[PDB]
Design an enzyme around this catalytic site. Structure first.
Site, PDB file in Angstrom:
ATOM      1  N   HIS A 215       6.650   0.520  -3.024  1.00  0.00           N
ATOM      2  CA  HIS A 215       5.570   1.245  -2.370  1.00  0.00           C
ATOM      3  C   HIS A 215       4.262   0.490  -2.358  1.00  0.00           C
ATOM      4  O   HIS A 215       3.327   0.922  -1.694  1.00  0.00           O
ATOM      5  CB  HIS A 215       5.340   2.592  -3.013  1.00  0.00           C
ATOM      6  CG  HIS A 215       5.201   2.544  -4.518  1.00  0.00           C
ATOM      7  ND1 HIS A 215       6.184   2.735  -5.407  1.00  0.00           N
ATOM      8  CD2 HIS A 215       4.019   2.322  -5.201  1.00  0.00           C
ATOM      9  CE1 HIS A 215       5.632   2.651  -6.598  1.00  0.00           C
ATOM     10  NE2 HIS A 215       4.334   2.401  -6.473  1.00  0.00           N
TER      11      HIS A 215
ATOM     12  N   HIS B 103      -3.255  -3.455  -7.494  1.00  0.00           N
ATOM     13  CA  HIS B 103      -2.456  -3.213  -6.301  1.00  0.00           C
ATOM     14  C   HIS B 103      -3.422  -2.758  -5.205  1.00  0.00           C
ATOM     15  O   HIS B 103      -4.636  -2.614  -5.392  1.00  0.00           O
ATOM     16  CB  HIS B 103      -1.420  -2.111  -6.514  1.00  0.00           C
ATOM     17  CG  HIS B 103      -1.976  -0.792  -7.067  1.00  0.00           C
ATOM     18  ND1 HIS B 103      -2.392  -0.568  -8.295  1.00  0.00           N
ATOM     19  CD2 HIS B 103      -2.152   0.370  -6.372  1.00  0.00           C
ATOM     20  CE1 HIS B 103      -2.813   0.656  -8.380  1.00  0.00           C
ATOM     21  NE2 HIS B 103      -2.662   1.210  -7.219  1.00  0.00           N
TER      22      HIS B 103
ATOM     23  N   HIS C 137      -3.711  -0.341  -1.382  1.00  0.00           N
ATOM     24  CA  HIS C 137      -3.189   0.677  -0.470  1.00  0.00           C
ATOM     25  C   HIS C 137      -3.793   0.248   0.883  1.00  0.00           C
ATOM     26  O   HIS C 137      -4.965  -0.158   0.927  1.00  0.00           O
ATOM     27  CB  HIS C 137      -3.685   2.069  -0.898  1.00  0.00           C
ATOM     28  CG  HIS C 137      -3.149   2.523  -2.271  1.00  0.00           C
ATOM     29  ND1 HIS C 137      -2.056   3.252  -2.498  1.00  0.00           N
ATOM     30  CD2 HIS C 137      -3.731   2.275  -3.492  1.00  0.00           C
ATOM     31  CE1 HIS C 137      -1.966   3.466  -3.781  1.00  0.00           C
ATOM     32  NE2 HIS C 137      -2.980   2.875  -4.370  1.00  0.00           N
TER      33      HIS C 137
ATOM     34  N   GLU D 211      -7.853   5.239   0.202  1.00  0.00           N
ATOM     35  CA  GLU D 211      -7.456   6.541  -0.297  1.00  0.00           C
ATOM     36  C   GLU D 211      -8.697   7.390  -0.396  1.00  0.00           C
ATOM     37  O   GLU D 211      -8.735   8.542   0.001  1.00  0.00           O
ATOM     38  CB  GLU D 211      -6.810   6.319  -1.656  1.00  0.00           C
ATOM     39  CG  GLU D 211      -5.475   5.588  -1.474  1.00  0.00           C
ATOM     40  CD  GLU D 211      -4.508   5.902  -2.609  1.00  0.00           C
ATOM     41  OE1 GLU D 211      -4.828   5.587  -3.744  1.00  0.00           O
ATOM     42  OE2 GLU D 211      -3.462   6.477  -2.351  1.00  0.00           O
TER      43      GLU D 211
ATOM     44  N   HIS E 212      -7.169  -1.283  -6.272  1.00  0.00           N
ATOM     45  CA  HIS E 212      -7.249  -0.570  -7.533  1.00  0.00           C
ATOM     46  C   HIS E 212      -6.948  -1.537  -8.667  1.00  0.00           C
ATOM     47  O   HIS E 212      -5.880  -2.171  -8.656  1.00  0.00           O
ATOM     48  CB  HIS E 212      -6.224   0.537  -7.559  1.00  0.00           C
ATOM     49  CG  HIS E 212      -6.462   1.673  -6.583  1.00  0.00           C
ATOM     50  ND1 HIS E 212      -5.548   2.465  -6.089  1.00  0.00           N
ATOM     51  CD2 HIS E 212      -7.674   2.075  -6.122  1.00  0.00           C
ATOM     52  CE1 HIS E 212      -6.153   3.357  -5.343  1.00  0.00           C
ATOM     53  NE2 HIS E 212      -7.426   3.101  -5.379  1.00  0.00           N
TER      54      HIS E 212
ATOM     55  N   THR F 218      -3.003   8.246  -7.998  1.00  0.00           N
ATOM     56  CA  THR F 218      -2.738   8.712  -6.647  1.00  0.00           C
ATOM     57  C   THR F 218      -1.285   8.622  -6.209  1.00  0.00           C
ATOM     58  O   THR F 218      -0.958   8.972  -5.074  1.00  0.00           O
ATOM     59  CB  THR F 218      -3.626   7.935  -5.701  1.00  0.00           C
ATOM     60  OG1 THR F 218      -3.319   6.535  -5.813  1.00  0.00           O
ATOM     61  CG2 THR F 218      -5.124   8.178  -6.036  1.00  0.00           C
TER      62      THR F 218
HETATM   63  C1  LIG Z   1       1.684   2.418 -13.723  1.00  0.00           C
HETATM   64  C2  LIG Z   1       0.476   2.662 -12.843  1.00  0.00           C
HETATM   65  O1  LIG Z   1      -0.485   1.897 -12.884  1.00  0.00           O
HETATM   66  N1  LIG Z   1       0.631   3.748 -12.070  1.00  0.00           N
HETATM   67  C3  LIG Z   1      -0.325   4.100 -11.231  1.00  0.00           C
HETATM   68  N2  LIG Z   1      -0.044   5.134 -10.512  1.00  0.00           N
HETATM   69  N3  LIG Z   1      -1.043   5.386  -9.628  1.00  0.00           N
HETATM   70  C4  LIG Z   1      -1.988   4.507  -9.782  1.00  0.00           C
HETATM   71  S1  LIG Z   1      -3.422   4.559  -8.750  1.00  0.00           S
HETATM   72  N4  LIG Z   1      -2.801   4.538  -7.282  1.00  0.00           N
HETATM   73  O2  LIG Z   1      -4.154   5.807  -8.982  1.00  0.00           O
HETATM   74  O3  LIG Z   1      -4.308   3.425  -9.122  1.00  0.00           O
HETATM   75  S2  LIG Z   1      -1.788   3.315 -10.989  1.00  0.00           S
HETATM   76 ZN   LIG Z   2      -3.660   2.705  -6.229  1.00  0.00          ZN
END
Ligand SMILES: CC(=O)Nc1nnc(S(N)(=O)=O)s1
Ligand SMILES: [Zn+2]
Ligand SMILES: [Hg+2]
EC number: 4.2.1.1
Length: 255
Positions: free
Chosen positions: A60, A90, A92, A102, A115, A194
């Site tokens: 994802h 990562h 989005h 987001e 993020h 998220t």
């Molecule tokens: C293991 C991990 O880091 N999981 C996360 N899940 N959502 C995230 S976020 N999109 O809020 O940054 S990080």
């Molecule tokens: Zn994220």
């Protein structure tokens, strides 16, 4: 869970009832209702010791993973008490440049959102920090399409190697300081992850200033795949959750 019609954000509540909770993320930042709080301290990003290990397509998003066994890359200051260690970052992004982030600022969506995920070291490991209301701090940075961000290019260049779900590549010596805007002005509110499990353990720190990336750089993101090798190809685009009800939380601004 995923982001399509049949398994996307509107269905997540059936497996994770916390989806309908009281401090879910992301949210729309209304700049006129955010409270300037003068007791908010400057952020302290100490990333000179960072050690990246590998980049991974997890079905994802793609994550760059960092060695977090020591206080190597840490966040403190701002709204935080204690030191938070960088474990991964990562993005989005969208299928088109006018959507992808987001969080939105006065309902404006940006092309992507970075993020940088940190966990509170007083809890010993990441798995313990997700059991606490102040276990995590995610630094969010908006991306707008404009000139190339030179510091993002190593990431863009390795993406072909991790095209499908489950693939990884060694990714050492990447310095995350090349992704930061000039100014560290921010908004902060209490929220959640998220993606599922959507745990409400996160202090969100969203930077005011976006970084520019080129059209060619964000196009490379759009070539990634959700599916695993040998499956029907599903392009990894629009992997963002829509804004959630603020439900009587207050967004504080450092400026
Ligand atoms: C293991 C991990 O880091 N999981 C996360 N899940 N959502 C995230 S976020 N999109 O809020 O940054 S990080
Ligand atoms: Zn994220
Ligand atoms: Hg929590």
């Amino acid at each position: 869970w995923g982001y399509g019609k049949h398994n996307g954000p509107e269905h997540w509540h059936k497996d994770f009832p916390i989806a309908k909770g009281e401090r879910q993320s992301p949210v729309d930042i209304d700049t006129h209702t955010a409270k300037y709080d003068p007791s908010l301290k400057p952020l302290s990003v100490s990333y000179d010791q960072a050690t990246s290990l590998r980049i991974l397509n997890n079905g994802h998003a793609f994550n760059v993973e960092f060695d977090d066994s020591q206080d190597k890359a840490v966040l403190k200051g701002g709204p935080l008490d204690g030191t938070y260690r960088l474990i991964q970052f990562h993005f989005h992004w969208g299928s088109l440049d006018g959507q992808g982030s987001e969080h939105t600022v006065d309902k404006k969506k940006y092309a992507a959102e970075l993020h940088l995920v940190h966990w509170n070291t007083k809890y010993g490991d990441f798995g313990k920090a997700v059991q606490q209301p102040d276990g995590l701090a995610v630094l969010g940075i908006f991306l707008k399409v404009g000139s190339a961000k030179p510091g993002l290019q190593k990431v863009v260049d390795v993406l072909d190697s991790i095209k499908t779900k489950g693939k990884s590549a060694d990714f050492t010596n990447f310095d995350p300081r090349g992704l930061l805007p000039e100014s560290l002005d921010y908004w902060t509110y209490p929220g959640s992850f998220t993606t599922p499990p959507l745990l409400e353990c996160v202090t969100w720190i969203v930077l005011k200033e976006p970084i520019s990336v080129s059209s060619e750089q964000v196009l490379k993101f759009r070539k990634l795949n959700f599916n695993g090798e040998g499956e029907p190809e599903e392009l990894m685009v629009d992997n963002w959750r829509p804004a959630q009800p603020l439900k009587n939380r207050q967004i504080k601004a450092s400026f």
